[PDB]
Amino acid sequence: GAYKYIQELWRKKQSDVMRFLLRVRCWQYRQLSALHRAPRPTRPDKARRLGYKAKQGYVIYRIRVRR
Amino acid sequence: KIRTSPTFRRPKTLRLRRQPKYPRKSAPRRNKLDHYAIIKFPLTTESAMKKIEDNNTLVFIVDVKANKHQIKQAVKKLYDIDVAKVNTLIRPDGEKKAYVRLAPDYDALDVANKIGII
Amino acid sequence: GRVIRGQRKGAGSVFRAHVKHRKGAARLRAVDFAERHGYIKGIVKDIIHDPGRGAPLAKVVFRDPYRFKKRTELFIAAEGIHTGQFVYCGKKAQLNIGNVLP
Amino acid sequence: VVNPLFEKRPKNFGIGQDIQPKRDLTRFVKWPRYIRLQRQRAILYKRLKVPPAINQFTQVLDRQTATQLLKLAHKYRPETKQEKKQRLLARAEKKAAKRPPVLRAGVNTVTTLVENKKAQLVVIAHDVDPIELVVFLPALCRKMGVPYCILKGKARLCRLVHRKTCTTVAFTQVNSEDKGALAKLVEAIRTNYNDRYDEIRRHWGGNVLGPKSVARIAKLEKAKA
RNA sequence: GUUUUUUCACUGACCCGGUGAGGCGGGGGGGCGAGCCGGGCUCUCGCUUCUGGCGCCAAGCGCCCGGCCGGCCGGGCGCGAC
């Protein structure tokens, strides 16, 4: 099943693959506004767990909090 | 085809007009400032009855919202008469007083018998 | 426990500059192709007094190298500038007074 | 015959002498924040040392082979929404009065039949935006002996199915007549991905500077020789 | 090789300055200088400085393309403006 392969792939955030993807997206997300609508979940897999079904009426925003 | 200006201005996108699937309110709210509801009562004051006999006018008490145009039809529609001009002042009481100067083809003191003031 | 005068000066409202009759921001002309690779000619219109500046300014009206309009820049007036003097600005412009170059 | 008034009136676009013409400024436009953003994302992919699990979606099936796989994949359209209705009229003919092979779309219903070895071929799309959906799949097919191929476009792979986009497409069992073309597609795929995956694992993307920064190194090479 | 690590420039986040983000970087066509008996090259400039005018909405040279009776009544597209 596809989701379990993305599941453990998101647990190796220290990896060469995910030290690139979390670094070039963290670039990308700073250039967009502080609080805007994401067209989809960045993680389909993680949103599966938290109850997001990909039907009409479910909304996902991508907001930043100053650290 | 090349960008002639160095500023990307937003392109003029098509917009559609309001086609309502239901009207918001069921009917249009009726004209509550009628020609009866705009002129309350004519003043029968000695100063007013002087103004009617001396200056070819009538003195009405008018609803505070009224224009000089609305009165110019209000006195025309209800008394079959014409108006030279209207001079509206709001009294210290808080009500409007229209000095409806009648055109000289009609008589002011004679039409005061029609409205029933003496 | 009262704030000192310098701390109050930093805030604003009262210790701000009186920029009403100030005849504008004394700055150069913006760099473009007619500054970097060659020169451009613009005439000195009138030397003028800026209230809140010891030195006078100069309305130097250049022709716009791109648009039909005619641009006007508030320069710091060099000593020996006069009205109707041609002030040239850019790389290939000469080395004399007012004549700005890199 | 000729008109002597018709005069050549030329312009001298030398600096200051005459006004400039309406020439190309496309590459000096202040673009919207989203157009600037997506462009210098594509640039960071070309500068930053891209790890080879992401770079393997640049090694794509070429122009000549892509259309050949789509040709046979166009035989196996999963039925249209209105073709669905046309099966349940062939139903109450027998009641009142086996299935043909298709493609299997998505990452779930492909990767559940890569370990199972019920896929004779996998068709990966290269431009899945949250890449992690697919990153594992080129590696997965190498272990289970399923020939994986990567295509240029998730939309054009989503054309074969009746949707907007589709990430992956697999062949389970095919028509006994049309095994020939399906088997010849495998050899050009298997010997271009699966037989050399350990070469794909040592294949780094980006680390290429700007073309005026690359062209300044050439100046610092042509000065000492 | 692997890491600790001083030292040069690298850009790619990140910061700054200007702009109405208007010609940036390579390369070529085109002019000044250098070397071989029309020849193929190493590098330089690339158009406005004698005066309180004028300059925008292209002339020019190409090429297809609308009628009526190969001759008569126009629009569009390229260099010009690599």
Q: Establish whether the CB of D39 is closer than 7 Å to any nucleic acid atom in strand E.
A: no
Whether D37 has its CB under 8 Å from any CB of chain A: the answer is: yes
Q: With CA atoms as reference, report the closest residue to B45 among B108, B117, B99, B113.
A: B117
B46-54 and B108-115 helices, crossing angle to 10°: 130
Find out whether D146 and D138 touch, Cβ atoms under 8 Å.
no
Identify how the structure was determined: cryo-EM
Find out whether D92 and A58 touch, Cβ atoms under 8 Å.
no
Find out whether D106 and D78 touch, Cβ atoms under 8 Å.
no
Q: With CA atoms as reference, report the closest residue to B35 among B79, B90, B89, B77.
A: B77
Q: Return d(Cα D102, Cα D95) in angstroms, integer.
A: 26
D225 vs C24, D213, D217, D221, CA distance in Å?
54, 19, 13, 7
Q: Which residues of D touch C88 (CB under 8 A)?
A: none
Q: With CA atoms as reference, report the closest residue to C46 among C55, C57, C33.
A: C57
Q: With CA atoms as reference, report the closest residue to D70 among D185, D183, D215.
A: D185
The sheet carrying D103-105 orders its strands as D103-105, D168-171, D121-125, D148-151
- Which H or E run contains C35? helix C33-36
* Alpha helices per DSSP H over chain A: 2-9, 18-31, 44-49
Q: Which residues of D touch A31 (CB under 8 A)?
A: 33, 37
Find out whether C59 and C45 touch, Cβ atoms under 8 Å.
yes
Residue type for position D32: P
Query: 3-state DSSP call for residue A21?
Result: helix
Residue whose structure tokens are 């789509």: D70
Q: Return d(Cα D194, Cα D200) in angstroms, integer.
A: 9
Q: Return d(Cα A4, Cα D60) in angstroms, integer.
A: 26
Q: How many CB atoms lie within 10 A of CB A17?
A: 19
Query: 3-state DSSP call for residue C59?
Result: strand
Q: With CA atoms as reference, report the closest residue to B60 among B68, B69, B48.
A: B48
- Which H or E run contains B115? helix B108-115
Contact B4 D31 (CB under 8 A): no
Find out whether B56 and B111 touch, Cβ atoms under 8 Å.
no
Beta bridge partners of D30: B7
Given in angstroms, what resolution was this structure solved at? 3.1
Contact yes or no, A with C (3+ CB pairs under 8 Å)? no
Residue whose structure tokens are 């680390």: D207
Q: Establish whether the CB of D225 is closer than 7 Å to any nucleic acid atom in strand E.
A: no
Q: What does the buried/exposed string (b/e) look like for C18-49 if buried means 16 or more CB atoms within 10 Å of the residue's CB?
A: eeeeeeeebeebeeeebbeeebbebebeeeee
Contact D41 A17 (CB under 8 A): no
Q: How many CB atoms lie within 10 A of CB D8?
A: 4
Q: Establish whether the CB of A30 is closer than 7 Å to any nucleic acid atom in strand E.
A: yes
Q: With CA atoms as reference, report the closest residue to C100 among C64, C67, C83, C81.
A: C81
Find out whether B61 and B19 touch, Cβ atoms under 8 Å.
no
